[PDB]
Design a protein around this ligand. Structure first.
Ligand code: 2GP
Length: 104
């Protein structure tokens, strides 16, 4: 229903929940996938106004609807904390360098 718009990508609440659930599970088990080994800590260099407390972890959310399994992560990420609360949804689309902007 387009709850989150990351550039040209559109994600529903359930899309985010599904991605987040998968990312948190690997985190619990101490597993990582991909050349950038996700999920990993997100330091919030961008200084986003997150309402949930740290630490935060970034995990890829795919436009195709599939759960990330180590391949190409793309530009979008879901950010969750240790309580498995959604901190936010961010993206490299529309940003410079390796910076992020929040999906609206
Ligand atoms: N842009 C950005 N990168 C972060 C942050 N936290 C950790 N990183 C990592 O710090 C480096 C510089 O941005 C990258 O390795 C990046 O990981 P990702 O590339 O996986 O996002 C953050 O809050 N913002």
């Amino acid at each position: 229903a387009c709850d989150y718009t990351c550039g040209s990508n559109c994600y529903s609440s359930s899309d985010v929940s599904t991605a987040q659930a998968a990312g948190y599970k690997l985190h619990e088990d101490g597993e990582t996938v991909g050349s950038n080994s996700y999920p990993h800590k997100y330091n919030n260099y961008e200084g986003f106004d997150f309402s949930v407390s740290s630490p935060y972890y970034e995990w890829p959310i795919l436009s195709s609807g599939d759960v990330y399994s180590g391949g190409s992560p793309g530009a979008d990420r879901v950010v969750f904390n240790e309580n498995n609360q959604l901190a936010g949804v961010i993206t490299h689309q529309g940003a410079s360098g390796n910076n992020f902007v929040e999906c609206t």
